[PDB]
Amino acid sequence: FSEEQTAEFKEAFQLFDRTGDGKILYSQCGDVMRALGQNPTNAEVMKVLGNPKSDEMNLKTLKFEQFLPMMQTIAKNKDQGCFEDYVEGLRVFDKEGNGTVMGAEIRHVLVTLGEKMTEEEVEQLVAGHEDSNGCINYEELVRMVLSG
Amino acid sequence: YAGKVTYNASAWLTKNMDPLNDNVTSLLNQSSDKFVADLWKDVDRIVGL
Numbered sequence: 001f002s003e004e005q006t007a008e009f010k011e012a013f014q015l016f017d018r019t020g021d022g023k024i025l026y027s028q029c030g031d032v033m034r035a036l037g038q039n040p041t042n043a044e045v046m047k048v049l050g051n052p053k054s055d056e057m058n059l060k061t062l063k064f065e066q067f068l069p070m071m072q073t074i075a076k077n078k079d080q081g082c083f084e085d086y087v088e089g090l091r092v093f094d095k096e097g098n099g100t101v102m103g104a105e106i107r108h109v110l111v112t113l114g115e116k117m118t119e120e121e122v123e124q125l126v127a128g129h130e131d132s133n134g135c136i137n138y139e140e141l142v143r144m145v146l147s148g
Numbered sequence: 149y150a151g152k153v154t155y156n157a158s159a160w161l162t163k164n165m166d167p168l169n170d171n172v173t174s175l176l177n178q179s180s181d182k183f184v185a186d187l188w189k190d191v192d193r194i195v196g197l
Contacts, residue, residue, distance in 0.1 A: 097180020 001072070009036050009071070013064050023061035026052055033071055042115050044074050083142055090138035100137050103130035170196040 001009065013032050016024045024032060030045045048070040052060060093101050093109065107126060110117045117125075129144065130136045176188040
């Protein structure tokens with residue numbers, strides 16, 4: 001990366017610290033990767049983390065020169081999921097094909113499938129994007145997560 | 149007024165009636181597309197015996 005944006009990338013990492021001690025954990029790593037510009041699969045992270053469990057995931061520390069090879073290794077990244085894949089991805093539960101699903105199934109599938117969400121993760125994401133029948137149209141929900 | 153017109157009457161019954169395979173139709177009713185599902189939600193009228 002350019003020392004221009006790498007200066008900025010450093011700052012956001014430093015603003016992730018808890019104390020000042022220079023050490024953002026194997027946990028928060030995922031948010032730093034995000035906040036710089038990424039949307040990693042929690043797997044993409046786990047890959048460069050070195051496969052820890054909750055214990056050393058919480059206990060092991062990172063510093064920036066331990067992080068920057070990670071952020072770099074992802075970034076020029078394999079395949080980035082288009083609008084088209086994603087809509088069909090949510091389209092899955094449209095019992096007929098309609099373009100629409102009930103906001104209850106949609107709140108739930110994200111809390112049961114793939115990289116599972118909490119209710120907190122879902123409600124903020126989905127709410128106010130169901131209509132006056134309680135259907136979330138998926139097409140716009142997909143666009144919403146894109147341009148965000 | 150403007151001329152004696154000939155009408156022919158063969159097939160008029162089923163023209164003022166409109167019958168169809170109610171089966172495929174009730175599935176056109178349960179369709180995916182907004183158009184087809186709006187267009188065919190009127191299944192009740194089709195006659196089967």
